[PDB]
Q: What sequence folds into this?
């Protein structure tokens, strides 16, 4: 019988700073045990300082991104070139996803950018449209490997102040763009070691008030 | 079923057995599987008898309506109409049809349309359950530009073997000759072909 | 379906079909409504050219829409039944979804909306 | 897994990758897939990992006892026959797929064994998830009358094809060369083309970071 | 939704319905009234699939109330029961049927007689002296066959009903948290607050 | 919901310095029966694009008709149909990709794997894949079916990344393709010896080669192979 | 998930957890399971995240349209019924929702309605919904009285979620508290179970099963 | 009805400089219901340590079985079993039940008393040995543990530093798994002293 | 067979077991004692598959009694619990396993301490301060987490137990017909006749 | 697989292709499907390779033990041992074996043993998936008492067609000649047989 879904593998990662945000993703595309492409981007600049990735079944992912990009275009036409805020984009994507509630887009969606106060923002979605703003989110095949590492390093979970008898927690603070990229690169190299669907290349999109910048790094190709 | 169509020097000949089965019971031992969709465009039917009769009737209607407006249709056109029906309704059909026809320009032509609804133009074609047993024989013995008598012997010997090995095939061997001369029906009985 | 725009504007900015509908109301028997301190009273005229009537079974001029709201009218009698039926259906629909009977203002707003819809819909007067 | 076997002039060579999987997760990044049945008879296994190890050890034990009993050096056909009759008896429930290779007084030999008990002969063979990538290389470059150095190259090239193109295979290349008249040479990590790059950061914690409730000395002595 | 009983006596119809609403391994409520007043002298109890029961009961209620206003007249219990039956008869051959069983207890003012109708989700209607839906009948019917008399008073009908509830509370596996009892007679519908 | 009946096997392709190469055998299988032997599975669109198709042949013929009709439609009211407003590989691919995804979304797919090879108007090489699920991807080498498992590894040894493309000539690239087709003939049970090969170059244009055969095959070593284990004779 | 809401002398307490799970994978520990419909209306979420989040925000839009059209805040009954009638239309399609519509109005007073995806709609004083509902019930029922103070009521609702967060594997993260009065709803903060548990254990002397 | 994920739990083992560490959570549940927060999954036979995840009845049964076998080993051999030897014994015993296996994920840890070499090993349910220099992971949060260990681990850590690494690897892995947590224990093993520490973690 | 509870307090172990035996839609009995005395200071309650429960309980009882006679000595609760666990551990990989869950409440005379062991049909053993089998735990565990203290008296343990039964009687779907309570202490095993 | 055995004037010849498939993948393209169970008693194997190898090995053991006690076995005896294994274990076997052997008394003989474990002595036999396509060709072209060269051409042409149409068949054509002279192995490559 015809199965309309597939798994194209790969993994994505979004982190929010004080005045910036990053959305990273590996460039490997796979089916079963074969490599389809060593460089197939899945993190996209959608305009209005919003970056987006829909990881999972790539056909559904490409369709969703394509539809959201189109939603931004029409938002400009219908509302006098108004800038689509990240929160408004998030709600819009919920309706796109939930519109196919009974035949879902098989993807974990993450968007990143700046909120209306200029502060770093990341929003994450389940396949059917439930969403939440977070400082930190990993998605895709290696999400289970990366996410607990982020809890420990970004949000300082299970880390107490030395000598305080485990009474005083390690204080939360915003990380620099340099420190965030270090955590991203270390997350992906670790994922590449322990996950077969992750590798080849790492593409990071960084969002600041100045615009969207790109950075590429090699990953192991085995 | 054992059906085949073979092009030759003067035109094309369609050949078929006459057995129709319901399981192991022979419902009809004198079936006519060679069916006219136009004067000199005929077809050999295999698969679901209900599906292939329904299709052939619709095609005959289309080609009659075509002729009234645009004149005599080409064999390629007839094959195109068969394909359109078989391809678009592939989920609800079990039909394996060989289309054969004679033009004055294009001479003898043969098109085969398998289950999926694809079209394949060929010098000769074989189909039906009994065809499996004669792929080897037909490939070794078929020549292009054969005479009428040679083509009749080829079809007779071929279907004789298909009938011999296929339980779903048997009875008489019917043949239809399509040339510039006209349309000729031939029949061959067991006592002749069995002892070839 | 019959699509004709029957209710349309005239050069002077009037919708004659709506204004001629008011003339039908002016022809109808008189109806009066007076509200007191703790009550409302609905008075209705019945023309006396009709004798040998059966007042038991003849449709009453005042109609209950729900147990707490009533509707009287002036104009075409047959037309009034269509509004009354729609109003009664809406009253029960309101109780079903809101779990509370209609306010008098709400019921009026519904009936008025139905009347308005028939002034800019095709194929209806 | 990618495994290969190649015959040459005066012997035979086998090779394998060093990735051990657990679904899409890489459990062991440097496992040894080349096993010893007898000193000059080696075995490469794919399929169910416990079965390949257990079956190669059992036949290896019985081969040793047989060699002692007969006062003769073990033959590859004996290991082949003992393996296939054992596997056939269990009707494929022992998921062992092997490439067997070695030298004995009769000469040099190369066989493949499948879980249901069927055997094959050949001059070049490949098994595992990366067998098609490896065989593509073998079909491109194999020729009659190979030298030892040509065979090792071909074999390791075939494994590399699987390492790079098959997600089930990775890390390093192990080789074993069995030449007639000589001792067999096991070349552990003959190639190491997948070295983990230096991490961007050290995650050594300050001492006292972890909150503790109770400490106690454990008695391991009598 | 589980236990609904009905007893028609001399001058009234008594409906008894369980108070429990259970979902999974939790009794979510123990005071649920599984009935709707269709008209002043007609009461309908119900049981079956969650959601469908109340949705159906309220739909019927609205239709009967609509009829009452339109004609300024109360439909007879027989007329209401036939309307309800037809709706269930339509429902069973729909895309998604109402899985709801009902008892309709009413007092016919023209005949001066109590009437009890049992209707299942298929649209199977029967007029009975006493009725039940679900597993309840397997205990109560035999008990009522023995103790029931046609000329009983309302008080005698309540004592008979107490005997049914006691038997159910003894032998039924599930805790249905007692019953709400309602009486339908010439004077209308009233609830027995202490049972 | 479909099932493929008459099928075509691997389509293989790669980029080289000035353009792209694509190849596919001339077989139309009917399950295990090698039914049809004269099936062209490379279909040129204009003088700058070649679409290579595998999977169900009836759906392939449907796609041929769509492409044929696309050229006709593009020529309507278009004075620059053979110049600036001619069909590009990227236009042809996106059209097919839209169709493939729409059909899977209606649970009625075209049971195919497609590779669109071509050269854009600015000279850029175009090579992209689409299949029955609407899944799309691009790579210096692309292949379908068995080709993905056996051809890609061989082709990736020539062009392992983007920077290897300018270093690869048409002679070297074609040799790797022809070698890959031989390997597939050895190891794919639903393949044939006869195949077609197409080269789309930015300078020399579209070169379409028909009736090619797999040659220089190694079979001699088979004579020495005896038995399945112990048998000596 | 564990959600509760109960009625008492001083109005309504509403308490929920913040854990989200996909199988045994803990997807999130910081999910908002209370929706703020308006200053006098709250909605709780259990079952499918998307179904609850989408349709209860949709519910707020419908409640807003009501007060525009009727120049009056919607009743808790009417609000709950819009949601229950909506999900009933989808019955059989596979929606998974266990919700509680809580609020105050003049005519009704403090009111709680339980609404779920198979069409059930129930008015009640006490409800617990979710995989950890039984654990919350155990603590809530044994300590519940109508004459509870606002302080003790808030704590009981918090303590009930904590109990469920501890025992139920698919409940945890943090506790979100809400109090609803005649004047509207009041937020009483986010309480991380990581710190809350040890604080409650020490101060209360409870949770002796755990290695202290 | 998946034997490996009914009771829940995790074990992790790491090597350091002249030392090894093995750690586990304390949870035992019945699917969603947490039943016990005192269920230790690490045992020792002489100086060889064994952690076992998976079906709790099999955890208990195998402990009793290896206690049985190592006691007889000691009486006959007149010496304590070594980690390398015990690893082979665990493998043999698991594979003996090839077509009716114990639903477990065992982990061996210890220091060889003769050579002084730190040793760890892991197994699948039918005994396939996973030997590793760096670390071994097992249980319902194995994916989480692989991720934590791969990033946090570095070679030649001192006992005091190794404790912090293994503790943080376990805790943060457990907090992303519903069926793991509810307390934790960490064994730090040196050549001739062993320290056992109970960790403070979130109890949900 | 449904509800079995256990609470270990300062100087005793208290087992509470439901009296209902239900088959189909009928409560066949409301006074069933779901326990067997294994030895003078060891008591085992049980629940699970019909037939298996009693058959298993009596088989264990016979074996422990056989041991008592042979050695003229009472086995410790820990020793009995281990024996029981092993039998269940054997059973789960048999042709037809015992589908029986047990609680073992005993007073160790050598240690002068009460002990409560929870063992399921798989052979999963745990020593606990309080325990339960089936759906009971989903209500009682959270209640006991809150109210339980380790230094409680027997009387305080009974009041705590009453609180559990009340919660079960309120929120459980099925009527389990109350519980039989038994206390295991230094002086042996006795039953609380009024609960 | 495509296998056949043909009796002729001087004895018997066994023929076979060399392709072994796992689905559509060719696991071995140079398989030897012609296997010795005794000096001048050989067999062609089709079906499960594990089952047919196991069977052939057991038969070889039985015939070696037979020879030690009772002298050279007849081809009929060898066929009987195959049958006994195939028939008694029919529920757990998928084996289609053709037995062929040369006696000095009985000359060349051929026995075929299909799936069920029945035995059929024949002048020639064909088996395997590719045999279906050459029932017609073989029936028309087989003659009794052919010469060695004629029998080689018959097998070569026959298997060539089987290979041409059957995807599961291919590679080289192996043949084993059994006569009084001795045992001769023959091989024929694609470049020769494909263009017949
Ligand atoms: Mg990788
Ligand atoms: Mg956890
Ligand atoms: Mg929890
Ligand atoms: Mg072939």
A:
């Amino acid at each position: 019988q015809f199965n309309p879904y597939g798994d194209n593998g790969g993994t994505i990662l979004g982190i929010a700073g004080e005045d910036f945000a990053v959305l990273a993703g590996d460039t490997r595309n796979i089916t079963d045990y074969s490599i389809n492409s060593r460089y197939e981007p899945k993190v996209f600049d959608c305009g209005d300082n919003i970056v987006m990735s829909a990881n999972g079944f790539a056909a559904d992912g490409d369709a969703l991104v394509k539809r959201f990009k189109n939603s931004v275009k029409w938002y400009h036409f219908d509302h006098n070139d108004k800038k689509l805020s990240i929160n408004s984009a998030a709600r819009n994507i919920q309706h796109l996803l939930y519109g196919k509630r009974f035949f879902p887009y098989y993807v974990h969606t993450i968007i990143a950018g700046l909120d209306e106060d200029g502060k770093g923002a990341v929003y994450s979605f389940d396949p059917v449209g439930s969403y939440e703003r977070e400082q930190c989110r990993a998605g895709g095949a290696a999400a289970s490997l990366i996410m607990p590492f982020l809890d420990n390093q970004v949000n300082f979970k299970n880390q107490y102040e030395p000598g305080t008898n485990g009474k005083v927690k390690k204080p939360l603070k915003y990380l620099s763009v340099e420190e965030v990229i270090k955590l991203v690169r270390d997350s992906f190299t670790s994922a590449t070691e322990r996950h077969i669907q992750v590798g080849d290349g790492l593409e990071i999109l960084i969002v600041t008030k100045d615009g969207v910048r790109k950075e590429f790094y090699e990953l192991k190709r085995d | 079923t054992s059906i085949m169509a073979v092009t030759f020097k003067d035109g094309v000949i369609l050949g078929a057995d006459s057995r129709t089965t319901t399981g192991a019971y022979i419902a009809n031992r004198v079936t006519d599987k060679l069916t006219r969709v136009h004067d000199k465009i005929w077809c050999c039917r295999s698969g679901s008898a209900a599906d292939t009769q329904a299709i052939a009737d619709i095609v005959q209607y289309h080609l009659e309506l075509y002729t009234s407006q645009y004149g005599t249709p080409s064999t390629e056109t007839a094959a195109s109409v068969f394909k359109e029906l078989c391809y678009e309704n592939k989920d609800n059909l079990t039909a394996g049809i060989i289309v054969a026809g004679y033009d004055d320009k294009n001479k003898g032509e043969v098109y085969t349309i398998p289950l999926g609804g694809s079209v394949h133009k060929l010098p000769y074609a074989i189909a039906g359950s009994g065809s499996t047993f004669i792929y080897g024989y037909c490939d070794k013995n078929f020549r292009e530009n054969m005479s009428k008598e040679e083509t009749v012997d080829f079809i007779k010997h071929s279907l004789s073997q298909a009938i011999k090995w296929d339980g779903s095939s048997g009875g008489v061997i019917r043949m239809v000759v399509l040339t510039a001369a006209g349309v000729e029906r031939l029949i061959f009985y067991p006592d002749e072909y069995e002892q070839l | 379906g019959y699509d004709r725009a029957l209710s349309i504007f005239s050069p002077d900015g009037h919708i004659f079909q709506v204004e001629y509908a008011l003339e039908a109301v002016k022809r109808g028997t008189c109806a009066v409504g007076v509200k007191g301190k703790n009550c409302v009273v609905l008075g209705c005229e019945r023309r006396s050219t009709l004798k040998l009537q059966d007042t038991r079974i003849t449709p009453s001029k005042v109609s209950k829409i729900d147990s707490h709201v009533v509707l009287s009218f002036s104009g075409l009698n047959a037309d009034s039944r269509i509004l009354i039926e729609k109003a009664r259906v809406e009253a029960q629909s309101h109780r079903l979804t809101l779990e509370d009977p209609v306010t008098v203002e709400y019921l009026t707003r519904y009936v008025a909306g139905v009347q308005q819809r028939y002034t800019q819909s095709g194929g209806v007067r | 897994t990618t495994i290969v076997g190649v015959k040459f002039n005066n012997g035979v060579v086998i090779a394998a990758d060093t990735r051990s999987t657990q679904g899409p997760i890489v459990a062991d990044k440097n496992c040894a897939k080349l096993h010893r049945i007898s000193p000059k008879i080696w075995c490469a296994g794919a399929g169910t990992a416990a079965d390949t190890e257990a079956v190669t050890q059992l036949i290896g034990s019985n081969i040793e006892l047989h060699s002692l009993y007969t006062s003769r050096e073990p033959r590859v056909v004996s290991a082949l026959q003992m393996l296939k009759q054992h596997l056939f008896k269990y009707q494929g429930h022992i998921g062992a797929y092997l490439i067997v290779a070695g030298v004995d007084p009769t000469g040099s030999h190369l066989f493949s064994i499948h879980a249901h008990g069927s055997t094959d002969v050949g001059y070049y063979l490949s098994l595992g998830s990366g067998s098609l990538a490896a065989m593509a290389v073998l079909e491109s470059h194999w020729k009659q009358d190979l030298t030892k150095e040509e065979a090792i190259k071909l074999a390791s090239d075939a494994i590399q094809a699987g390492i790079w193109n098959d997600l089930g295979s990775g890390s390093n290349v192990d080789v074993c060369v069995m030449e007639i008249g000589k001792d067999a040479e096991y070349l552990r990590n003959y190639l190491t083309p997948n070295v983990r790059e230096e991490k961007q950061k050290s995650y050594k914690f300050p001492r006292g970071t972890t909150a503790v409730l109770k400490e106690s000395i454990v008695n391991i002595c009598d | 939704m589980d236990i609904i009983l009905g007893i028609r006596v001399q001058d009234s119809v008594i409906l008894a319905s369980s108070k429990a609403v259970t979902r999974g391994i939790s009794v979510l409520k123990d005071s649920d009234d599984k009935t709707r007043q269709l008209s002043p002298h007609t009461l309908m109890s119900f049981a079956g699939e969650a959601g469908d029961t109340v949705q159906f009961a309220e739909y019927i209620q609205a239709n009967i109330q609509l009829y009452s206003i339109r004609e300024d007249y109360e439909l007879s219990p027989q007329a209401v029961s036939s309307f309800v039956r037809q709706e269930l008869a339509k429902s069973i051959r729909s895309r998604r049927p109402y899985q709801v069983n009902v008892l309709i207890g009413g007092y016919d003012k023209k005949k001066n007689k109590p009437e009890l109708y049992q209707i299942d989700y298929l649209g199977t209607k029967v007029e009975l002296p006493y009725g039940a839906h679900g597993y309840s009948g397997f205990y109560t019917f035999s008990l009522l066959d023995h103790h029931y008399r046609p000329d009983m008073t309302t008080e005698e009908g309540l004592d008979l009903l107490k005997l049914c509830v006691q038997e159910l509370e003894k032998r039924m596996p599930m805790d249905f948290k007692g019953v709400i009892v309602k009486i339908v007679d010439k004077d209308g519908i009233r609830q027995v607050d202490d049972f | 919901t479909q099932q493929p009946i008459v099928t075509g096997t691997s389509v293989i392709s790669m980029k080289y310095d000035n353009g792209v190469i694509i190849a596919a055998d001339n077989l139309g299988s009917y399950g295990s029966l090698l039914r049809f032997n004269g099936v062209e599975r490379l279909i040129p669109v204009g003088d700058n694009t070649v679409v290579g198709i595998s999977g169900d042949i009836s759906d392939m013929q449907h796609i041929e008709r769509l492409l044929k009709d696309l050229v006709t439609e593009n020529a309507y009211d278009n004075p620059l149909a053979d110049a600036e407003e001619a069909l590009e590989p990227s236009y042809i691919f996106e059209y097919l990709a839209t169709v493939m995804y729409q059909r899977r979304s209606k649970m009625n797919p075209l049971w195919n794997a497609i590779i669109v090879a071509g050269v854009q108007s600015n000279g850029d090489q175009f090579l992209r894949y689409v299949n029955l699920l609407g899944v799309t991807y691009s790579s210096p080498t692309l292949a379908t079916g068995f080709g993905a498992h056996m051809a890609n590894p061989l082709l990736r040894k020539v062009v392992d990344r983007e920077s290897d493309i300018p270093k690869t000539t048409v002679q070297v690239a074609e040799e790797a393709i022809v070698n890959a087709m031989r390997v597939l003939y050895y190891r794919d049970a639903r393949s044939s010896r006869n195949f077609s090969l197409a080269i789309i170059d930015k300078n020399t244009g579209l070169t379409f080669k028909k009736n090619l055969q797999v040659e220089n095959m190694k079979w001699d070593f088979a004579k020495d192979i005896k038995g399945y284990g112990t048998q000596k004779i | 998930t564990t959600t509760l809401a109960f009625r008492f002398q001083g109005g309504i307490i509403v308490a929920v957890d913040s854990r989200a799970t996909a199988g045994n994978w803990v997807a999130s520990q910081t999910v908002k399971k209370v929706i703020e419909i308006n200053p006098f209306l709250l909605g709780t979420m259990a079952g499918c995240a998307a179904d609850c989040q989408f349709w209860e925000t949709w519910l707020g839009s419908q409640c807003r349209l009501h007060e525009l059209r009727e120049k009056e805040r919607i009743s808790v009954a009417a609000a709950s019924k819009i949601l229950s009638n909506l999900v009933y239309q989808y019955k059989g399609a596979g929606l998974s929702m266990g919700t509680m519509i809580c609020g105050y109005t003049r005519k009704e007073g403090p009111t709680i309605y339980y609404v779920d995806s198979d069409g059930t709609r129930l008015k009640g004083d006490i409800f617990c919904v979710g995989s950890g509902q039984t654990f919350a019930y155990g603590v809530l029922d044994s300590n519940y009285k109508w004459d509870l103070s606002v302080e003790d009521a808030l704590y009981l609702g918090k303590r009930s979620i904590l109990a469920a967060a501890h025992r139920d594997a698919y409940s945890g993260g943090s506790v979100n508290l809400y109090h609803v009065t005649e004047d509207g709803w009041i937020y009483h903060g986010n309480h991380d179970v990581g710190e809350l548990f040890w604080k409650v254990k020490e101060e209360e002397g409870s949770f002796n099963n755990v290695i202290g | 009805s998946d034997p490996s994920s009914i009771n829940g739990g995790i074990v992790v083992a790491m090597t350091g400089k002249d030392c090894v560490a093995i750690a586990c959570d304390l949870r035992l549940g019945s699917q969603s219901l947490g039943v016990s927060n005192k269920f230790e999954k690490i045992f020792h036979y002489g100086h060889v340590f064994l952690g076992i995840t998976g079906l709790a009845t099999d955890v208990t049964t195998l402990n009793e079985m290896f206690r049985y076998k190592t006691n007889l080993y000691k009486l006959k051999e007149e010496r304590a079993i070594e980690p390398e030897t015990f690893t082979q014994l665990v493998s043999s015993s698991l594979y003996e039940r090839r077509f009716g296996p114990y639903f477990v994920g065992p982990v061996v840890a210890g220091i060889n008393s003769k050579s002084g070499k730190p040793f760890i090993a892991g197994f699948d349910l039918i005994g396939c040995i996973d030997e590793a220099k760096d670390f071994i992971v097992s249980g319902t949060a194995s994916d989480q543990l692989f991720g934590m260990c791969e990033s946090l681990y570095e070679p030649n850590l001192e006992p005091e530093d190794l404790f912090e690494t293994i503790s943080q690897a376990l805790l943060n892995a457990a907090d992303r798994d519903a069926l793991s947590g509810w307390g934790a224990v960490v064994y730090i093993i040196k050549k001739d002293e062993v320290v056992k520490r109970y960790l403070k973690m979130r109890q949900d």
